[PDB]
Amino acid sequence: SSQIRQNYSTEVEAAVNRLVNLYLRASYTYLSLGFYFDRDDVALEGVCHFFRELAEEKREGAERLLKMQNQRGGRALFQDLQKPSQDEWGTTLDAMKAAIVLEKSLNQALLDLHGLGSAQADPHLCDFLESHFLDEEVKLIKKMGDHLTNIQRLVGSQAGLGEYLFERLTLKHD
Amino acid sequence: SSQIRQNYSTEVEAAVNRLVNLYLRASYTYLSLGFYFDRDDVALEGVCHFFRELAEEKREGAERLLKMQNQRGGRALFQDLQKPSQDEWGTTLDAMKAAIVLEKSLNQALLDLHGLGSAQADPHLCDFLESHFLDEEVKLIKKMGDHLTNIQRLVGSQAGLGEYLFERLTLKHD
Amino acid sequence: SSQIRQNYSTEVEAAVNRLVNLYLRASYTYLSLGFYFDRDDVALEGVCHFFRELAEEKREGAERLLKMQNQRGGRALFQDLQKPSQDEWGTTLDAMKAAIVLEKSLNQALLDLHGLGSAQADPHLCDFLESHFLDEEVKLIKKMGDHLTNIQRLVGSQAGLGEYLFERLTLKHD
Amino acid sequence: SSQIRQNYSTEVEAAVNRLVNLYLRASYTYLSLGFYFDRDDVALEGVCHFFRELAEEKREGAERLLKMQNQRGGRALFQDLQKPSQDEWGTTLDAMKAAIVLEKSLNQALLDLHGLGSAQADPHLCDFLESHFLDEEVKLIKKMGDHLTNIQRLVGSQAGLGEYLFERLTLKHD
Amino acid sequence: SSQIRQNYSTEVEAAVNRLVNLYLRASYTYLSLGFYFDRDDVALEGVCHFFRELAEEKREGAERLLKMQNQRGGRALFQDLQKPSQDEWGTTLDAMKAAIVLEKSLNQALLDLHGLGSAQADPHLCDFLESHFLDEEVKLIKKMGDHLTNIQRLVGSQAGLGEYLFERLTLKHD
Amino acid sequence: SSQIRQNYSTEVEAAVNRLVNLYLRASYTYLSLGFYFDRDDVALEGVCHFFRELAEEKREGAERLLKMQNQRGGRALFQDLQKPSQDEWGTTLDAMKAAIVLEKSLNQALLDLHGLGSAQADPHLCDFLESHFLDEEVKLIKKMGDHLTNIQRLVGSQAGLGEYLFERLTLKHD
Ligand SMILES: [Cl-]
Ligand SMILES: [Cl-]
Ligand SMILES: [Cl-]
Ligand SMILES: [Cl-]
Ligand SMILES: [Cl-]
Ligand SMILES: [Cl-]
Structure with a gap:
């Protein structure tokens, strides 16, 4: 038996390992989103940076869970990581809708x-x-909801113009 | 009788207390405006900040009136504060029109x-x-009039685009 | 329906709006307390400053609640704000007793x-x-209880002397 | 009755006083452990410092509990403090095993x-x-478990060598 | 036999261990005194700080004795620590009288x-x-005697006023 | 067709995507290795840090490949990521042997x-x-080979002692 484990159920230990998988899956989804917006035929730098940042945040959340697992005397167990749900992510609006779905699932x-x-x-x-x-999750979902509203406002009859403007004037870029 | 009061009519004393109520009402109106623009389904940060700043300014005006009341030897008397006139404030244009109405009433x-x-x-x-x-009031009303003109210019046939652009390029945001 | 709301009951949303009203009422009570102690016929600067500080703290608590309401996807709803319970607040002892009653109600x-x-x-x-x-509330109630004890100790047979000394030697003044 | 007490049961108040006793007992145990490793016939400075640090930490935990007791309006009540369970603590391994037993009891x-x-x-x-x-307790128990594993690895067939090396290369000394 | 012990009698060794117990008892007494003056219904911060400082000083004296015991090759032996003589300590005058009794016993x-x-x-x-x-003991007893005289001078017919003033104007507080 | 692609074969594009998968698999393997050495029953901090660093390096190599894919006008395609080959990694020697196998496969x-x-x-x-x-790969394999030799030298008849010493005196720790 573990020398440190105390008040740490097998059910929690297992659920923590599953959550690690969910966070690493989310990280992988965000890596794919980021590189899609870096495509020369998509080319929305601020959108790319937004999702690359989230890939790092989700990786870090998995790492914090794994640290905690060991602090409690549970045992990390890793499973296969499924690929993201899409290979191409559509518009910034499509991507931000997919992101909020993903975040609600993590929440x-x-x-x-x-x-x-x-x-x-x-x-x-x-x-x-x-x-x-x-x-952290509440804050992020609120941010995404704010972004969705602004993206939606900008579609109008000039979708390309709106998608450029949102990327330029809301999202962080060089 | 008051040991300091001199040349300070009961009519002025009462009117000062009423004006305090009007300023605190205005502050409360601006608090509501600010938090409406912070809604995830409204999400216009610069508009939120504009009205939150005004809520503080109106609070400070009430405090200055109360300080003066005591300096003259009058007696502060507080009354119930009515809630703002609306629960939802419409567009930035609707809000700025309501604000200038409110400021003309204070003026x-x-x-x-x-x-x-x-x-x-x-x-x-x-x-x-x-x-x-x-x-201070003349300056603020002039600012609001300037804003109204710019908001109105931006409606065009693309209201959402215009409302985004005004928030991004005229109002102060992070 | 709300794009961000998740696990946020209508009962909590309503209770948060009621608590906002309670905090703004408390803020208003403290504004009245502060300006009463600034009267030339009361003139206890440290007592004035104590309650003016609390008016700001309670305002800030209402603002934090309103921020949270929006972060969760609830809707701020403001109601009329009742005036404070008294127009004149008696001695520092009377005021501090009223304050602890108020704080226990908020708690x-x-x-x-x-x-x-x-x-x-x-x-x-x-x-x-x-x-x-x-x-924050526990700490404040403990502070007020400490103050009440010291005020009570100082009444003796020389109430005016005690009330001056408490204001001068415990409360913060210029 | 207490002027500040609110939502603070007599059962909690009593249990807090008992926990204070447990923490002060633990502090005393660590004082004894520390001075045992300072004996000229034991002479493991890093081990001494490790346990002297814990004696201070446990004292500080008791002080925080006592501060909280007063903040809630409960009444500190002190009882006799039993002496530590041993006068001599054996090897570093024996001591670290006794420490983790003690920490699990506090936890x-x-x-x-x-x-x-x-x-x-x-x-x-x-x-x-x-x-x-x-x-804080989870972190400390994890640290102790890490130490136990390293101590155990170093016993081998050369216990004295291992106990020196652990003290020199893991524990903090001058 | 001890490798370092020289000219160190068993009688001295035992008496040093007893003195350690007396100092730790004194420390515990001062911890109780300190937290009594932190009660919301006592609330004399300077008095609290005075006795909390002494609890630390007495702890440090016990630690110095234990260091010396080991430097001489004697063996620390710890005994149960009796609880302080009182649960409630009365007035600042009662407390300072109890403190000087305690210090004369240590002396x-x-x-x-x-x-x-x-x-x-x-x-x-x-x-x-x-x-x-x-x-160190002579200096402390002289300080306490000075305090007793000042406390006694301040009782007069207005005990509460005097006890406040002593705490405010002689003892160190924030 | 792609507006930027030039001299970039479909065979290279596919092989780059496969290599991304291999690097992310390697990163995941190193994450597992790192957290295994953080277990309280393993507790080799320097070994943990060594493999956590490599998990980051392999992630960064995948990111560089993905950046290059887009610079050339190829399309990132992500596949499922298989879990590491083991759940528990044995001794530092076992782990370093597995690492060099993995690095030779990447090379x-x-x-x-x-x-x-x-x-x-x-x-x-x-x-x-x-x-x-x-x-970068040649350098890393040389480092690992150097480590293997030193680990092997330290096994002797006292494996635990050797594994501690290597972790303490070769690998970087706090
Ligand atoms: Cl899949
Ligand atoms: Cl109304
Ligand atoms: Cl009313
Ligand atoms: Cl015992
Ligand atoms: Cl006793
Ligand atoms: Cl597999």
Whole structure:
């Protein structure tokens, strides 16, 4: 048995490993989104940078989960990582809609794990998610919702113009 | 009787308390405007910041009036504060039109109080309003009129595009 | 429906709007307390500053609640703000007793909302209150209790002397 | 009755006082461990420093609990402090095993108190433990487990050599 | 036998261990005094700080004794630590009277140990106490006597006023 | 057809996408290695850091390949990422042997792609690999070979001692 493990259920341990997989999948999705917007026939630098940043953030979230797994005396177990859902991501609007779908799925997984921890009377797990994940996710979903609204406002009858302007005047670029 | 009060009519004292109520009402209106533009389904940061700044300015004007009330030996009396006139504020154009209506109402209240002070031969009151309120109000109404003209110019046949551009290129944002 | 809202009950949304009203009411109460102690016939600068600071703190708490409402995809709704319970606040002891009553009422509203969030399995709400409100309130009530004890000790048979000394030697002034 | 106490059960108040006793006992245990490794016939400076640091940490945890007791309006009550379980602590391996036993006992007491607070709907207590105790304890137990593994690896057939090397190359010394 | 011990009697070794117990008891007494004055219904910050400082000083004196025990080749032996004599400490005057009683008891224990060392022709022990304990104790008792006189002068017919003033104008606070 | 693509074969484009998969697989392998050495029952910090660094390096190599794919007008295509070959990695010696196997496989894939580029008369591809991959790989394999030799020298009859010493005195740790 583990020399450090205390109040750490096998159910939580397994769910943490699954969440790691979900975060690494999300990271991979964002890597694909980023490089799609770097295509010479797409060429929206700010959009590329937005999603490349998120790929790093999701990687870092998986790493924090893995650190916590070891701090509690659980055992990291890695599974195959499925490829992203699409090879080409459409417009900035299509991409941002796919991103918010993805983030809502991660948020629900966090809420589910928090509920398991609550049920198992695992306050360290619950605190961990509250401190490092739940508000980060709320903030990000709010940002994406703000972006969706602005993108939608800019479609008008001149979609190309709007998509350029959003990239130039809202998103961060060199 | 008051140990300091001199040349300070009961009519002015009452009118100052009413003006405090008007300024705090205005502050509350601007708080509502600000948070409406922060909604994820509205998402115009520069517009939000514009009105949040005005909520602070109107609060500060009420505080200056209350300080003056005490300096003259009058007695602050607070009344209930009515909620703003709307729960949702429409477009940036609708909001800026509502703001200029509100500011003209505050301006007329200032002019009325100045007239009362003149009639009562209360030069300290008249000076106070001239020094800290009348030109501030003229300047703000001119700014709002400038904004209205630019907003109106941008409606064209592409309202969403215009409303984005005004927020991005005229109003202050991060 | 809202594009960002997730795990955010209508009951919590409503209770957040009510709490905003309670905090803005509290802010208004403290504004009145502050200006009462600035009266030339009251003239306790440190007491004035103490309550003016609290008016700002309560305003800021309402603003944080409104920011959170929007981050979750709820809708701010403002109601009329009732005037404070008194026009004149008596002695520093009377005022500090009224303040602790007010703070206990805010604390109970926070605890009630935390309980609703717990019941609704809304950990982001619960975390939010824990992180930004509950300990701030405990700390403030402890400070007020400390002040009450010192004020009470100083009444003796020389109330005016004691009230001066407390203002001069405990409360912050210029 | 207490002027500040609110939502603070007699059960929590008592359990906090018991936990203070447990932390001060732990501090005393670590003081004994530290001075044992400073003996001229033991002479493992890094081990001495490790346990002297923990004696301070446990003292500080008791002080934080006592501060919180007063912030909530409970009453500190002190009991006799039992002497540590041993007068001589054996090898570094024996000592580190005793330390992890002790830390698991403190951790379980924290988890028990968190559970009481949950049952009593005392979110300030629960937050307090989450914010200042639970993760600190997880981190420390993980560190001790890491140390145990390294100590165990170094026993081999040359225990004295291994115990020197661990002290020199893992633990902090002058 | 000990490899370093020289001219260090078993009687001195035992008496040093007893003195450690007395100093740790004193430290614990001062911890209790400090937290009593932090109660919201007592609320004398300067008094709290005075006794919390002494709790640290007495802890440090025990640590210096334990260091010396090991430097001489004696063996630290710890005993149970009795709880302080009171749970509630009365007025600042009551507390300062209890403190000077406690310090006179520590002083007599130091003088007794110095006498034992003299009798045993143990000049290192005698020097140690002279250099690090005897004058520190004389200085502290003189300070406490000075405080008692000032506290007593301030009782008059207005005890609460006097106790506030002493805390504010003699003792160190934030 | 692509507006920028020139002298970029479909065979190279496909092989670049496969190499991206190989590098991301390698990154994932190193993530698993790193977290295995962070286990409380393994606890070799320098070994953990060594492999976590390599996980980042391999991620960065995949990113450089994807950037190049777009610069040439090829299309990134992502595939599922298989999980690492082991869940537990044995000793530092076992791990370093697995790492050099992995690196030789990456090196051969680089050499194969260089050969394809040579055959296709694609000097930009050949230069790219020479400039950013081939020498980096040679250097890393030499480092790993150096480490293997030192690890092997340290096994002796005291494997645990040797594995500690290598981690402490060759690998970088805090
Ligand atoms: Cl798939
Ligand atoms: Cl109304
Ligand atoms: Cl009312
Ligand atoms: Cl015992
Ligand atoms: Cl006793
Ligand atoms: Cl596989």
